[PDB]
Amino acid sequence: SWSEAFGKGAGRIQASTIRELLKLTQRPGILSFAGGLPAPELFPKEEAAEAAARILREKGEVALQYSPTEGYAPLRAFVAEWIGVRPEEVLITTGSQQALDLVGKVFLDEGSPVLLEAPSYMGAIQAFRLQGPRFLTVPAGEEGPDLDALEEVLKRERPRFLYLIPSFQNPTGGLTPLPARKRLLQMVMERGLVVVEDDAYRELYFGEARLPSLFELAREAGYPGVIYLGSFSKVLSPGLRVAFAVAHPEALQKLVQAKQGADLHTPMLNQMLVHELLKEGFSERLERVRRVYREKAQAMLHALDREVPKEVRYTRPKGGMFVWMELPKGLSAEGLFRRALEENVAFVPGGPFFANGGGENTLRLSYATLDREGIAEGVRRLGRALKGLLA
Amino acid sequence: SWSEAFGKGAGRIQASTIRELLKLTQRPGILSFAGGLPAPELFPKEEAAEAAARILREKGEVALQYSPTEGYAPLRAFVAEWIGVRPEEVLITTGSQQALDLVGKVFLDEGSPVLLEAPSYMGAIQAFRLQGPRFLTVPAGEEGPDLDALEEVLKRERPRFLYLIPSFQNPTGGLTPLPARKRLLQMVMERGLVVVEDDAYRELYFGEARLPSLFELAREAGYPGVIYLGSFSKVLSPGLRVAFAVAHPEALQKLVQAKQGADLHTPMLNQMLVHELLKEGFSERLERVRRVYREKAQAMLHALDREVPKEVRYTRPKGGMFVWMELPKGLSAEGLFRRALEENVAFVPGGPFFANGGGENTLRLSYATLDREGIAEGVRRLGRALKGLLA
Ligand SMILES: *Cc1c(COP(=O)(O)O)cnc(C)c1O
Numbered sequence A, B: 001s002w003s004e005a006f007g008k009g010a011g012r013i014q015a016s017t018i019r020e021l022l023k024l025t026q027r028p029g030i031l032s033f034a035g036g037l038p039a040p041e042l043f044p045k046e047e048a049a050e051a052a053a054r055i056l057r058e059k060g061e062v063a064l065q066y067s068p069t070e071g072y073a074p075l076r077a078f079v080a081e082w083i084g085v086r087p088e089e090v091l092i093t094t095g096s097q098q099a100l101d102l103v104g105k106v107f108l109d110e111g112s113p114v115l116l117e118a119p120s121y122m123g124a125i126q127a128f129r130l131q132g133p134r135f136l137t138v139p140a141g142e143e144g145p146d147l148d149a150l151e152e153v154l155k156r157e158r159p160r161f162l163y164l165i166p167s168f169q170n171p172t173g174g175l176t177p178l179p180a181r182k183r184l185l186q187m188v189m190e191r192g193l194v195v196v197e198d199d200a201y202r203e204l205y206f207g208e209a210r211l212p213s214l215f216e217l218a219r220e221a222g223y224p225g226v227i228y229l230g231s232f233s234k235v236l237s238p239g240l241r242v243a244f245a246v247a248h249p250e251a252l253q254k255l256v257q258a259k260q261g262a263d264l265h266t267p268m269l270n271q272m273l274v275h276e277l278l279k280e281g282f283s284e285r286l287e288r289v290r291r292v293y294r295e296k297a298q299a300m301l302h303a304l305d306r307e308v309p310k311e312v313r314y315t316r317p318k319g320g321m322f323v324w325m326e327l328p329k330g331l332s333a334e335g336l337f338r339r340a341l342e343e344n345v346a347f348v349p350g351g352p353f354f355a356n357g358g359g360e361n362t363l364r365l366s367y368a369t370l371d372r373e374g375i376a377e378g379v380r381r382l383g384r385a386l387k388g389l390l391a
């Protein structure tokens, strides 16, 4: 009765990896390497308590009332200055996840081609699948998408957009280097193609500098086709659900009109709260997150080097939150997942990151949430798990 | 280029009368009867401020973290207890706007028939339009939907659901009476149809009691086909963006799953804040809400009775936030809108509340936001614009 009452969209949302992952802060028996849950030590609880009370006492009539679809104006200006655009070109979203939904709505139809990497971000796959697209993929490795494979796709297909995460890809941790960013921009400019650039990990670089985004390079070239997404989730607070999109006025208007119908506007308190927290001392805060994830990455890498047999490969990220692991072809990461849970350690099997399937032997390890010894203890429990499997 | 890069969904979100609405910060010499903005005098800023700081100090690690798609457990339980269902039958949404978006994705396809009133809630029309459905309408009256017209439509057509607002409809303020609710249910159960019941103004009744919802009647009868949408927007704070959907598990699970891809989850602070504010003294708060709006409605109606020429017709609501006004056929509400801007007063012309168009001589007035003396002044201005139009 219900199964016959649903429309086509109902058959396009079957995957439950996001919501199952979301139920990961147990109570609290789980050494979790699953879910890129930011370092809770980084949460400025006291500052947020202070700022939220003050907003509500002094600006409660704005904080509590319906508000414009585009965002809290001082947040839009803050973001405009940080990114290097005007406020009119910024839309505040209810996380970057909403932004992915909105891009799916404005650009995809049933059977529409969309290009993304294999593997790529699960939330993006989930948001886009809703529209019934044809997923076109290109492999993703340590240094970004395979551009020779892209070249071949582009001779045959015109994707509605390319979805890319040049800086520390979810789930691989891949970093697209500058000359590859440049070639990518050329290929896209030559064909007049649309890029969706998800920069959630922008500030989480372990090197001496971040690379220019595809958005910045496009902007220096005078190319209007890059839609740039950013978030305060990995930098401040996921729970607040505050992010942004930056786009050419025409693309932006479509996104604004779609967001209107999505949730009217992003909760105002949350935006005003993000602003209050960040408007002073943002750089210093950023330098600290950077310090913290570098350390957690180093702890996991050293623990893996000590605990993990050389028959299994894993990446060594230059930023972000993830180590991506590959078992020998023929071992299953879900199998591995069962055993890991029987040691009270969780990770994400790789399957869900692959839009068209495959990737059975792969898995994503997140070092974001646990401190050093929790990382060291989890990896040891994972070492015991993998060794029992390869034996 | 951009208009060539867009998909079909971009053609379907063209509408934008919520944005220019939500931009009504219009400073400050316009008296606006546009937009159902809850009375700011009702905002509990000080309780809100204290609750928020306490949440962020005591529970910041949860409030600021990624969180389950289903919602804050104690908010679900509070809702479940209020509405008379089980917690796991409650989905928390980022406004009732999100619930509508989600309902559209799971139920509607291109060329899908949906049925709603003419006129009806324009946020519903916007959310549903996105899917490219065929809108079937039924006239809305002071006693709700014309059930004779609904009977005729149902012979010819099987709508994927009926979207209705039985208690104080947006925009008419119509109240579907009990005998008409019982008949609507019979017509639906006979045919195994899905009802989406939007109950935003549930608690804003001006009489001695509220009428049972379609949802409560269905439940009494054992019929699983009503999806019930509630919101804290009209009783507490629209800005926080917290609302809920209640539905049969198969329906609800599809809603949770669509939500995963929409925003991951509703902000936890906001859900925690609403629950803290309501866990005690909710009935008493609702009684103050009711008194305030009864007062403002009576202020509105007396001013209209005093200032309005008898050739123009208007409703006398039994609750909610709106008066629906009809000009002599031949006259134009958009013209009045222009003239009313010369007399420094605003409202929402009726046109966009009509899915397939019509209602050019109709308009909606909101007594919700202005104080009683603002109401009397705004109406006297309206009365001057109207008598210029009538001469
Ligand atoms: C975390 C993430 C986002 C989604 O984050 P939000 O919390 O919705 O802002 C977007 N893209 C990538 C690649 C991410 O991993």
Ligand SMILES: *Cc1c(COP(=O)(O)O)cnc(C)c1O
Residues within 6 Å of the ligand: A263, A264, B036, B094, B095, B096, B097, B098, B121, B123, B165, B169, B170, B198, B200, B230, B231, B232, B233, B234, B238, B242, B243
């Ligand atoms: C105000 C209103 C809503 C509530 O919208 P939210 O998204 O919860 O703020 C929903 N339906 C109708 C008919 C309304 O008038």
Ligand SMILES: CC(C)C[C@H](N)C(=O)O
Residues within 6 Å of the ligand: A017, A018, A021, A022, A034, A035, A036, A037, A123, A170, B066, B264
């Ligand atoms: C919803 C969560 C599972 C998503 C999170 N950003 C991650 O990739 O780990």
